[model samples]
Target: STGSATTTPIDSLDDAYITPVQIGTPAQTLNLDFDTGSSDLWVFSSETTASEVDGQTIYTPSKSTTAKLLSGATWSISYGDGSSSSGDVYTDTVSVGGLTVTGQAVESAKKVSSSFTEDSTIDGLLGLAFSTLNTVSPTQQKTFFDNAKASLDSPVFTADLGYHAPGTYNFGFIDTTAYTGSITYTAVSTKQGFWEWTSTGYAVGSGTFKSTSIDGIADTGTTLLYLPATVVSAYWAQVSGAKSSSSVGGYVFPCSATLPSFTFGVGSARIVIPGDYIDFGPISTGSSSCFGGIQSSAGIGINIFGDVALKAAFVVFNGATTPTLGFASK
Candidate 1:
């Protein structure tokens, strides 16, 4: 079996992509961020405190006849950006697109950070990384993809994140028409519970490619692309008036300045991110200085090919016994 879901960005900045998800028996639909960096299907629900609930939708398990509490089970998760959520666990019927998974572990959020409360578009997060990274206590829970893998035509999922438009997430089978040219496959390491891989190298605009090996995770949850300091510096240096400002808190440049495109190698293929995509809007409201979509990973401790990079191409997260990642130009 196969399924496909449309993932639309929450805002014009493409801060995060959200997909409609159905949980519980009668189907309480919520827009969730399909994060590839974490592995816990969590949602804002009746368990969340009133203070933390903004205008976002909530899932009420009590309204679902199929909902069952998982005694002694709990979950807590925190992201690199410091946003976090934690709560009790429940097993219920959950569906993504048309693919349904019975007895799926759906974490009900009781507490959440202020960042989550401020984002009214995302009701919760649906983790797509390996299930081993699940934060559930007592017993680890399988991700929706992992639980439905056996029923799928092929153990694979694809992400086609867009710049400002809506993209797609395909489960079980690859959509041949969504991408161009041949796919370049690479090995993936699930040790850290991420879709981690080694990128061949990178190039700054029209410059020559650097043959360095960079380790990073393909994270759809993150907004920016993080690489080595040296690589980030090279890209920024090409843009006039670009600087690492303390007040702006990242690499920022004049919005009027021309920016060079960035190219990164995946296996034998190279995906080029357009210059306009790197200019991630103004540093402040109505400010002329724009923040860069690519930043240094020195502080984060690990390189990340986030939405800024992934949006340039079609990505495949293969769940075969031997996990592999495939990249194709779109």
Candidate 2:
């Protein structure tokens, strides 16, 4: 059976996209971040330390008769920001949109970092990445997508992430009306457990399209787009008063600057990101300098086509044996 769910940005900044998910028999609905960059569906739960719990909702396993502890199984994960969580695992009825999956692994957070506690917008994260990336030990578990694909009309799911608007995530089949133009499909390499693909090249505004190939991952979880220094520097060069500052954080420019659009190639197709999206608001309250949505991935090693880039087009994460990604204009 096919299922569709609406994903909305947590705030004006589009820091994260969240979708309501139902878990267990009574169906406790929680807003979860559907992350494509990582695996292992985890949630804030009754097992979490009271001090670690803030304003976010927590899942109570003891309240659900369907919840069963996965003896001896545990999971742990850390993010680049140093935020992390780990705990014992449980299996229960999990549902997204209208699709249901019984015996879905749900890692209960026993401890969470201050970073997660400070953010009250998200109750948990529902991983959509490859199951190989699952942090569960002793026995790795399949992702929600992996478990549901078998029952879907087609082994595929699509991501239509929005800027300030609401988007939808569809399981099983692509919504033909959701996108325009033909989709450009590319092979995905799960070598590192990511939806890794290579872009044809890029162009800064209407300038000449650079022919350099860029390898990156389509990460809906990441807030900004990160590319090689050369690509990022070139794009920022077109904007007057733009500079990378240590104090202001990454690339920042005068708020009044005329920004240029960013375009990336997929086969013969070109996906252009509006200049307005690049001006990611002021560095601080009442500040005149604004942070850029595109940053250099030099320190991160791998380039990441995050939410900043994903919002510009329709993305599809195909779960075929030989996985592939599709991009289209919207």
Candidate 3:
């Protein structure tokens, strides 16, 4: 597997929804977001006051016949994007497709920001990322995977995102039928919550900018791929009539010509970035331009490969089965 987990950009206002796997018998359906950035299951509740919760879906425990709350455990989290929420610990019967798991750990938010409170239909997030970075385990205490592992059929859990349309995300045991059999297992480094890996080098069209041996991290939290400054500049040099546009941030290039295909070498694996992703979104500059998949994070140290790169393959987080991360193609 070359990718981590497949994620879909969900539009809550639209009908896009995920049928969560319930934890108990005669399971009920719970809508969730397949978020790879974090690992916690939160839902909106009827107890949530209209004034407090916004922009998120609330899971109503009263409506769930199998829902139960933990005695004293509580949770609250804030993200780099400045979004925050606080809630209580609860357990419920979770169901996804035909699989049912009982007594699954869940969070019910009572206090949320205007960003979350405004969208009544946009319930809580379902974190499927990494266990090492989980907020629920501040003291190395508990995690969604630790609690739900007992109910899973296979030690592995796979997330599949629908390609054509956004918001079609699915999860459950990895269906052997969906894979090509050869699983690429990567050793999980004990560092931050991010899944870090090494790249062999980078290539843009016919030009080889850097060597393949480079340390990097693959993050589902970040929406775009960021590369080193040296590597990025070397890549943009190949674009036809490519000129830097200051108005749209110097990282972007202004040109009407088609950009060439860029590929990153990861040891034996060669990952390629499509032309559409090569161009960053338009900036104030009048020239239509393309942005290198790589960017300068400066002090961030390692390069972070975002969703655009991970979507190319099937990513499996097999922490339950082994300490390693697995990648496979769908």
Best lDDT among the predictions, by candidate number: 1
TM-score of each: 0.99, 0.99, 0.74
Poorest lDDT segment (10 consecutive residues) of candidate 1: 275-284
lDDT values, one for every candidate:
0.95, 0.93, 0.57
Which residue pairs show collisions in model 2? none
lDDT of 1 by residue, 39-65 (tens): 999999999999999988999999999
Q: List candidate 2 stretches off by more than 4 Å.
A: none
| lDDT, residue 235, model 3 | 68
Clashing pairs in 1: none
Residue-wise C-alpha lDDT for candidate 2, range 1-330, written one tens digit per residue: 888999999999898899999999899888999999999799999999999999999899999889999999999999755789999999999999999999999999999889889989899999998999999999999999999989999999999998799999999999999999889999899999999999999999989998888999999989999999999999999999999998866999899998999999888899999998787889999999999999999989799999999999999999999999999999
Q: Residue 177's C-alpha lDDT in candidate 3? A: 68
Candidates arranged by TM-score, highest first = 1, 2, 3
Q: What is the TM-score (0 to 1) of candidate 1? A: 0.99
